[PDB]
Design a protein around this motif. Structure first.
Motif, PDB file in Angstrom:
ATOM      1  N   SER A 320       0.826  -1.193   0.000  1.00  0.00           N
ATOM      2  CA  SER A 320       0.000   0.000   0.000  1.00  0.00           C
ATOM      3  C   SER A 320       0.867   1.253   0.000  1.00  0.00           C
ATOM      4  O   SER A 320       2.071   1.213   0.270  1.00  0.00           O
ATOM      5  N   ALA A 321       0.234   2.381  -0.320  1.00  0.00           N
ATOM      6  CA  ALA A 321       0.942   3.654  -0.287  1.00  0.00           C
ATOM      7  C   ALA A 321       1.488   3.929   1.106  1.00  0.00           C
ATOM      8  O   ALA A 321       2.629   4.373   1.259  1.00  0.00           O
ATOM      9  N   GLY A 322       0.686   3.660   2.136  1.00  0.00           N
ATOM     10  CA  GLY A 322       1.169   3.841   3.496  1.00  0.00           C
ATOM     11  C   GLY A 322       2.327   2.921   3.826  1.00  0.00           C
ATOM     12  O   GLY A 322       3.301   3.333   4.460  1.00  0.00           O
ATOM     13  N   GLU A 323       2.295   1.688   3.439  1.00  0.00           N
ATOM     14  CA  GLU A 323       3.318   0.724   3.575  1.00  0.00           C
ATOM     15  C   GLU A 323       4.596   1.171   2.918  1.00  0.00           C
ATOM     16  O   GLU A 323       5.699   1.097   3.475  1.00  0.00           O
ATOM     17  N   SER A 324       4.523   1.639   1.716  1.00  0.00           N
ATOM     18  CA  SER A 324       5.574   2.184   0.948  1.00  0.00           C
ATOM     19  C   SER A 324       6.224   3.349   1.644  1.00  0.00           C
ATOM     20  O   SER A 324       7.449   3.460   1.765  1.00  0.00           O
TER      21      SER A 324
ATOM     22  N   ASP C  68      -4.562   2.456   2.466  1.00  0.00           N
ATOM     23  CA  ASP C  68      -4.595   3.760   2.994  1.00  0.00           C
ATOM     24  C   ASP C  68      -5.605   3.880   4.105  1.00  0.00           C
ATOM     25  O   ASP C  68      -6.780   3.577   3.886  1.00  0.00           O
ATOM     26  N   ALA C  69      -5.253   4.301   5.272  1.00  0.00           N
ATOM     27  CA  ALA C  69      -6.034   4.427   6.439  1.00  0.00           C
ATOM     28  C   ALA C  69      -7.177   5.384   6.238  1.00  0.00           C
ATOM     29  O   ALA C  69      -6.939   6.505   5.779  1.00  0.00           O
ATOM     30  N   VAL C  70      -8.383   5.050   6.554  1.00  0.00           N
ATOM     31  CA  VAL C  70      -9.594   5.776   6.492  1.00  0.00           C
ATOM     32  C   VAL C  70     -10.300   5.793   7.818  1.00  0.00           C
ATOM     33  O   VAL C  70     -10.598   4.709   8.333  1.00  0.00           O
ATOM     34  N   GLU C  71     -10.604   6.897   8.405  1.00  0.00           N
ATOM     35  CA  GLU C  71     -11.346   7.076   9.588  1.00  0.00           C
ATOM     36  C   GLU C  71     -12.823   6.896   9.362  1.00  0.00           C
ATOM     37  O   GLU C  71     -13.349   7.404   8.367  1.00  0.00           O
ATOM     38  N   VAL C 115      -4.178   9.082   8.722  1.00  0.00           N
ATOM     39  CA  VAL C 115      -5.418   8.778   8.124  1.00  0.00           C
ATOM     40  C   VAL C 115      -5.579   9.536   6.836  1.00  0.00           C
ATOM     41  O   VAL C 115      -5.467  10.768   6.844  1.00  0.00           O
ATOM     42  N   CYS C 116      -5.827   8.917   5.729  1.00  0.00           N
ATOM     43  CA  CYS C 116      -6.057   9.483   4.457  1.00  0.00           C
ATOM     44  C   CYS C 116      -7.333  10.278   4.401  1.00  0.00           C
ATOM     45  O   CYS C 116      -7.432  11.318   3.739  1.00  0.00           O
TER      46      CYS C 116
END
Ligand SMILES: [N][C]([C][S])C(=O)O=P([O])([O])O[C][C]1O[C](N2[C]=NC3=C2N=[C]N=C3[N])[C]([O])[C]1[O]
Ligand code: MG
Lengths: 1334, 153, 153
Positions: A320-324, C68-71, C115-116
């Motif tokens: 994932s983008a966050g992982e990256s 991507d983290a979503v609240e 959080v995205c």
């Protein structure tokens, strides 16, 4: 200036990182720039800009200290210590002619070959894209436009070279408009298409390097796909292509320019540029080629050579983008490139899954480096292949690991100048079969793999496949979205069908872990939890063990039913009550004899009821029984006794004065019976079964009552053993299978059928007994049942045999096939695993049938109460299908070794998992939790099913007088014999005193040999085309330097040498036939007129020297048998000259040489009263040691790799006080020069007789030089009492080894061949011995 | 550890249970009871509960340090290091024994008392604070304040 | 050790899959099937799935992408379930918070989470994270199917 320089670095880093100049400038001297988002692609561009500048630096240098300060320092130094890189490029390579392939290109090309190892594949990327609707006409136009724009896209490949066509003759765009098909039909056809073209062998031979294609699915979906041959294009080039395509589809007007930088030009320039670096790298690699690691030792279901058409399977994980982001951040914090992160991880996984932590992996480098910035627009295969040596240290934090990995990689990047391909080629040229079938391709530049230009027109990369040939596992990385696409383009069927998936999952888990965890965490990956769980299940099986003294059950039985039959012997049978009474009498005698609980007691008795009773009384007295076969030799017996610290030795001999107090078992049977067995704690020592021991000292495996009883229970509860059952005690006492026989069977109440001592190996006897007594249980090494089964069913009835235990040696896969028709209905073969040191056994594979996939009968489940661990060299558990060291654990372990704490510690290792024996067995779990045993890496081997450490047999030989070093092995053939090799010790001494009657030779002989050389050189040089160019040059130079201009003389030469014009004609004709017939160099030694030792036997008055050397054979004067040996027989040519006089009355002659065919010729030409023996593979039979009063060497001692070799061979071959006879060349013979040149051997082997006598005295002989000095030095030397003899050797081995592990065939060597590591070449020796057998 | 990591089925409570234990680990995951040193404790021995297996969280979102601290490694694999106390029974059952640390339960939901303390210390005029779950039927959370007095001349 | 090994080694029931997979499977199988029950209203599998997919499509329109983290900060109800399934469906990782969660702690979480996006009853792109109205998301174009997620995600 430093500051100005800093400014310039700031500028370049700004350019490369895409950061503000000011911001970059702000970065500290000590600030890690990989911390600042620098990568190797950027940093190789910076290295190229510094090199253009003239400030030449190694990427290693830059990337080892990737901070501004370090670079500044380096550059400062460099500016005055480093040379510029202003290499004048070739002006141009014709842009339409076939030009050379890149190294990587070469590699990929070679792979196309059907006969290539795991080849027969394109090396193409297949790309897959998804879009709702795109115009096919636009796509076709774009494809043709990119082909025309980019020369490489239309490049034809032939004969290992590449040519760029004006326009390829083959289609570029594959349109498949399937809007008319059904959704299911269209999807299936698409699948087919995918499975075809994803693996397609692109028609590179016709310029079809690049093939775009479209499928219009009926569901309103257009599936863009791209088959690109990486022969043509680097994957950075592929993305460039993507960009180009996107622009040409959306707006071809915006296509800026066709790059002018023709690939051939690039190649030439690059080559010229890297020449220096290339050579440097080549020296590097050459210094490291012998020490390169092999390919990753991954589990392979199928041999890569066995895969004709390797199908590629992608394993994809979109980080994932966050992982990256997290990875990037962490990599920066730890001062490492993101690619080194991924690579490190990959390497770790490989290592974990690899039998060897050290391995090669092909890292394609970005190598786009040219002067013209426009190079970053070219579509060519700009890759360069790095042969990355990675040595993954275990137990370190991932931080450490990654750092190390990066360092290694960065160091090697410079070394990549010398291509991987060429490295490998040299490895094969040097005999190293090493390869790099595992690729790591980190395409991590943040623009995204799929360019925006492409993304806008079509969806992001949906799916892809590599087809890299010679590559097991093509690991790639792509910037997908803003994330990372983890790709494992594994080969279908290559790996276990479930392996790659698992391994990739572990890889992903590690990466994720990295994402979400600090890198201080161990680099050692966890096992895939499935695997661990499985193995935990297998290991955790509850102990059947009713923890008790090992004797308990038996005595219980005897009290319950004393009249029940316990033992069955030749004719007599012994009841439970009788056996218990006898054992208790023995125990009472032992306690009377001073024995007391846990005190080691030796049991040296012939197989029978008294043996059983002795063991049982030993146990009953609280003691620990040390079983030893009566056959056990005195010396090894003593060794064992000493080692054991044996309190007493039960035997048929009363000898209190022995080393240990030795008592007659019969007298002990007269002793007062104990009321009951001494109360023993289960934990107490039961038996000390003496394994063979690698240092030469036999090793005692001290097994507790607890441990043995645990195993026995585990197996009893499984066999359902009961009173009605009857075992067969085929198992020797000193083999722990008999512990199950004795204790198990008797405790269960099962009777024991006891073979007599004479019956110890009598299959017939076994069969008879079985038939007679209705034996229901068998227990042995499979070697004993194979022996049994050898007997026809009619002669041997086994149908009573309810269940069978085979163990402690390889159970052959066809043995259940033989056994099921033989044994009872409901056959119950169990095959049991694990060493002496784990009680008796530690595994059970039941074998109701052998399924086809078993390469051997595996170790099954661990037995209840005990466990297995397969581990790396480091102790970490190996994944499933991974070969590692078998670790037995649990209730069944031996207490250790008897009196070897050190070894105990070494072997019986500890862990958070507990105590483990550390077998040195190799093996692997399977995906179903079965445990394949895979033999042994080491010296422990199986002979007749018994356990022998080859280091014991070697030490028992080295103990022998006159032995320096020895090697032992198990040989091939049906026999599967043990054999061994000897290195004599010659007792070097000062015998260099020399006197030399050099009155005979005259320079006229040298002139005569020069004239004969002139004649022969003229004879052949009249037909010089039969030689090769080098030999022609050498012979042309010699015609003067050794024949004409050096020592010209008369034709009297021939009358001095002996051979006349007829002889010269024969020599010339034979030489011409030898060269024309391609029989050289071997057939030269088959000719009396051309063999160097044969010509030396006539030319330098060699026949007179032969006559004198033939003298001093005193058999006629002695009037008694004499034995004479020859080391330089070959074809027996000089012997053919002097044989008639040599064969004196009473003379026994033997002929030796390191060749079978040459000695066959010698036997052909020489009479029948002469013995002939070949030093097969340079190997001397031990039979001939000290057997010959005289040994003869003739004008060939120089031919040996060292005079010490032949001198030691002769000294060993000489009977004590025997005399060597030796004639050797001190000065070159001009005709022997031609002979050697035909052999192509160096004339430098020769040396003057002072060195010869120095070496001979170093060989322990006392020499005397007789006559003829410089031409033919006749040396005779006496041999001292080396003590080596076949008889002597035999005696010694009888003294120090049981007949089960004495070498049946014994050999001798002057010196042991050595492995590349410097260790004894046991494989080579084994092979040699095997060949020597016949 | 995913959501859960144990299951004790409770058809009946035998008298010997001082608390309803953690039962068997759920399939695909595991428990380790360890000493302060990480070595596994024997049966009946009070130690730190270590959850492991397929059910572990990837870690903490943006707390690698803490992740490392908690989601520890071993030759046995990856383990969460809960700070739950507990012990294995002779039968294999896993008695959970509460917690030594600040993680406590309020209304069944999870609170770290160090959070409540830090959320009080964040308050203007607070030097230090202490929080605890109180006795009584209510099982209330309460806390204690240490004012900061702004010393001056 | 053996006992505990047995305990620990119980094979994973896990049909390793994306957490959302099963529900969507069900939905496809039986869209009409009752999925959620509320105050008075009931939501079918199909309805729920549709809603979730619309949410997902809005998310991806809002820049959300796999992992991507979503609240998710919604009152308990159908909308909240839809929101998390869409988050999952979008390939994203849902960061649930109670609507009751205070602004400050909310901010803390958001920051920590990286959080995205924040699914709420409130449209506020100017918030710390881009804050979106669930309802608006519900108006977004429905995805053909959930974003293909690796189970490890
Ligand atoms: N008896 C026996 C045990 S079982 C003895 O003692 O011997 P040993 O040596 O120890 O054993 C053998 C060897 O190898 C192995 N094994 C076992 N089992 C088996 C084997 N192999 C094969 N197969 C089988 N089954 C062990 O571990 C050792 O090393
Ligand atoms: Mg053994």
């Amino acid at each position: 200036s430093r500051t100005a320089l800093r400014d310039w670095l700031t500028e370049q880093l700004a350019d490369l990182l895409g950061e503000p100049l000011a911001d970059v400038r702000a970065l500290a001297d000590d600030d890690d720039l990989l911390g600042c988002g620098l990568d190797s692609i950027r940093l190789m561009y910076l290295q190229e800009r510094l090199r253009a500048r003239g400030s030449t630096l190694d990427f290693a240098q830059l990337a080892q200290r990737p901070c501004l300060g370090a670079w500044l320092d380096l550059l400062a130094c460099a500016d005055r210590l480093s040379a510029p890189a202003t290499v004048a490029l070739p002006t141009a390579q014709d842009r339409d002619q076939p030009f050379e392939l890149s190294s990587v290109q070469q590699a990929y090309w070679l792979g196309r070959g059907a006969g290539e190892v795991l080849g027969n594949v394109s090396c193409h990327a297949f790309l897959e894209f998804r879009t709702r609707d795109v115009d096919p006409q636009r796509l076709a136009a774009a494809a043709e436009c990119v082909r025309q724009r980019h020369p490489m896209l239309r490049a034809r490949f032939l004969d290992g070279r590449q040519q760029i066509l004006p326009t390829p003759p083959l289609s570029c765009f594959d349109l498949q408009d399937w809007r008319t098909l059904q959704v299911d039909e269209a999807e299936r056809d698409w699948q087919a298409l995918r499975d075809w073209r994803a693996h397609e062998c692109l028609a590179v031979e016709r310029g079809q390097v690049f093939l775009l294609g479209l499928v219009r699915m009926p569901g309103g979906e257009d599936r863009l796909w791209l088959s690109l041959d990486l022969l043509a294009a680097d994957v950075e080039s592929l993305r460039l292509l993507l960009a180009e395509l996107g622009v040409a589809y959306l707006a071809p007007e915006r296509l800026a320019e066709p790059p002018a930088l023709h690939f051939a030009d690039y190649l030439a320039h690059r080559a010229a540029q890297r020449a220096e670096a290339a050579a440097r790298a080549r020296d590097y690699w050459l210094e490291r080629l012998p020490r390169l690691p092999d390919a990753p030792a991954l589990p392979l279901a199928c041999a890569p050579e066995s895969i004709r058409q390797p199908r590629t399977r992608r394993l994809a994980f979109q980080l994932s983008a966050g992982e990256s982001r997290r990875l990037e951040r962490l990599a920066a914090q730890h001062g490492v490139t993101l690619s080194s992160v991924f690579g490190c991880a990959f390497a770790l996984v490989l290592a974990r899954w690899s039998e060897s932590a050290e391995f090669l992996l092909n890292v394609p480098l970005f190598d786009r480096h040219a002067d013209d910035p426009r190079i970053g627009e070219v579509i060519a295969d700009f890759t360069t292949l790095l042969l990355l040596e990675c040595r993954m240290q275990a137990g370190v934090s991932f931080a450490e690991a990654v750092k190390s990995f990066q360092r290694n990689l960065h160091g090697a990047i410079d070394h990549a100048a010398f291509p991987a391909l060429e490295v490998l080629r040299e490895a094969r040229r040097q005999g190293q079969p090493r390869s790099a079938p595992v690729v790591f391709a980190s395409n991590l530049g943040e623009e995204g793999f799929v360019p925006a230009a492409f993304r806008d027109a079509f969806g992001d990369l949906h799916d892809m496949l590599s087809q890299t040939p010679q590559v097991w596992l093509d690991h790639q990385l792509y910037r997908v979205g803003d994330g990372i696409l983890l790709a494992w383009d594994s080969v279908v069927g290559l790996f276990p069908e479930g392996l790659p998936e698992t391994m990739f999952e572990a890889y992903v888990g590690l990466l994720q872990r990295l994402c979400d965890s600090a890198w201080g965490q161990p680099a050692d990956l966890p096992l895939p939890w499935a695997q661990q769980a499985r193995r935990a299940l297998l290991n955790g099986q509850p102990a059947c063990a009713t923890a008790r003294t090992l004797h308990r059950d038996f005595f219980l039985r005897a009290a319950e039913a004393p009249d029940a039959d316990a033992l069955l012997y030749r004719d007599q049978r012994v009841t439970r009550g009788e056996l218990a009474e006898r054992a208790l009498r023995i125990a009472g005698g032992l306690r009377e004899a001073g024995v007391r609980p846990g005190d080691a007691v030796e049991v040296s008795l012939p197989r029978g009821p008294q043996q059983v009773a002795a063991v049982f009384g030993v146990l009953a007295a609280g003691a620990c029984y040390v079983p030893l076969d009566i056959d056990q030799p005195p010396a090894r017996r003593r060794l064992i006794e000493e080692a054991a610290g044996v309190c007493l030795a039960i035997t048929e001999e009363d000898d209190p004065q022995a080393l240990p107090p030795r008592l007659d078992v019969q007298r002990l049977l007269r002793g007062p019976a104990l009321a009951a067995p001494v109360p023993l704690a289960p934990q107490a020592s039961a038996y000390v079964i003496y394994t063979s021991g690698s240092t030469g000292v036999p090793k005692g495996v001290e097994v507790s009552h607890a441990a043995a009883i645990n195993t026995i229970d585990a197996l009893l509860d499984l066999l359902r053993v009961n009173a009605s059952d009857r075992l067969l005690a085929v198992s020797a006492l000193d083999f722990d299978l008999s512990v199950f026989d004795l204790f198990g069977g008797l405790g269960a109440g099962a009777s024991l059928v006891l073979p007599a001592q004479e019956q110890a190996r009598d299959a017939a006897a076994w069969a008879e007994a079985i038939q007679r007594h209705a034996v229901s249980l068998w227990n042995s090494a499979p070697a004993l049942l194979e022996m049994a089964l050898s007997l026809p069913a009619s002669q041997a009835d086994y149908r009573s045999l309810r269940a069978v235990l085979l163990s402690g040696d390889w159970v052959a896969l066809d043995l259940p096939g033989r056994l099921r028709p033989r044994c009872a209905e409901g056959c119950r073969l169990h095959v049991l695993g694990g060493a002496t040191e784990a009680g008796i056994w530690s595994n059970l594979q039941s074998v109701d049938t052998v399924p086809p996939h078993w390469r051997s009968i595996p170790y099954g489940r661990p037995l209840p109460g005990q466990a297995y661990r397969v581990v790396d060299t480091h102790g970490r558990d190996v994944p499933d299908l991974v070969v590692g060291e078998l670790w037995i654990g649990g209730a069944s372990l031996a207490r250790g070794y008897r009196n070897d704490p050190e070894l105990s510690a070494r072997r019986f290792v500890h862990d958070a998992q507990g105590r483990w024996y550390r077998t040195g067995d190799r093996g692997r779990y399977w995906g179903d939790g079965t445990l394949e045993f895979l033999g042994r890496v080491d010296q422990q081997v199986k002979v007749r099913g018994q356990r022998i450490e080859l280091g014991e047999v070697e030490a028992a030989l080295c103990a022998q007088a006159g032995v320096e070093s020895a090697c032992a092995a198990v040989l091939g053939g049906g026999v599967a014999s043990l054999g061994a090799v000897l290195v004599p010790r010659l007792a070097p001494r000062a015998e260099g005193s020399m006197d030399l009657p050099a009155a005979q030779p005259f320079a006229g002989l040298a002139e005569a040999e020069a004239v004969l050389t002139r004649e022969i050189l003229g004879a052949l040089l009249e037909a010089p085309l039969e030689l090769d160019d080098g030999l022609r040059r050498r012979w042309l130079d010699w015609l003067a330097d050794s024949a004409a201009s050096a020592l010209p003389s008369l034709d009297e030469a021939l009358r001095r040498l002996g051979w006349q014009a007829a002889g010269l004609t024969a020599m010339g004709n034979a030489l011409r036939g030898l060269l024309a017939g391609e029989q050289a160099p071997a057939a030269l030694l088959l000719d009396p007129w051309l063999a160097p030792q044969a010509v030396a036997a006539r030319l330098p008055d060699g026949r007179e020297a032969l006559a004198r050397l033939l003298e001093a054979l005193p058999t006629p004067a002695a009037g008694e048998r004499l034995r004479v040996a020859v080391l330089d027989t070959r074809a027996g040519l000089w012997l053919d000259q002097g044989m008639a006089s040599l064969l004196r009355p009473g003379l026994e002659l033997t002929l030796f040489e390191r060749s079978r065919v040459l000695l066959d010729a010698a036997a052909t030409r020489l009479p029948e009263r002469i013995v002939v023996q070949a030093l097969d593979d340079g190997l001397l039979p031990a039979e001939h040691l000290g057997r010959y009063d005289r040994v003869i060497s003739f004008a060939a001692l120089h031919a040996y790799e060292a005079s010490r070799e032949g001198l030691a061979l002769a000294a060993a071959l000489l009977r004590p006080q025997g005399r060597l006879l030796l004639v050797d060349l001190l000065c070159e013979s001009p005709l022997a020069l031609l002979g050697a040149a035909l052999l192509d051997d160096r004339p430098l082997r020769l040396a003057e007789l002072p060195s010869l006598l120095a070496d001979l005295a170093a060989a322990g002989l006392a020499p005397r030089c007789l006559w003829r000095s410089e031409r033919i030095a006749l040396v005779e030397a006496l041999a001292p009492g080396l003590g080596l003899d076949a008889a002597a050797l035999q005696a010694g081995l009888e003294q120090r080894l049981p007949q089960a592990m004495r070498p049946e065939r014994l050999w001798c060597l002057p010196s042991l061949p050595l492995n590349g590591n410097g260790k004894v070449d046991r494989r080579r020796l084994a092979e040699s011995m095997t060949r020597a057998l016949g």
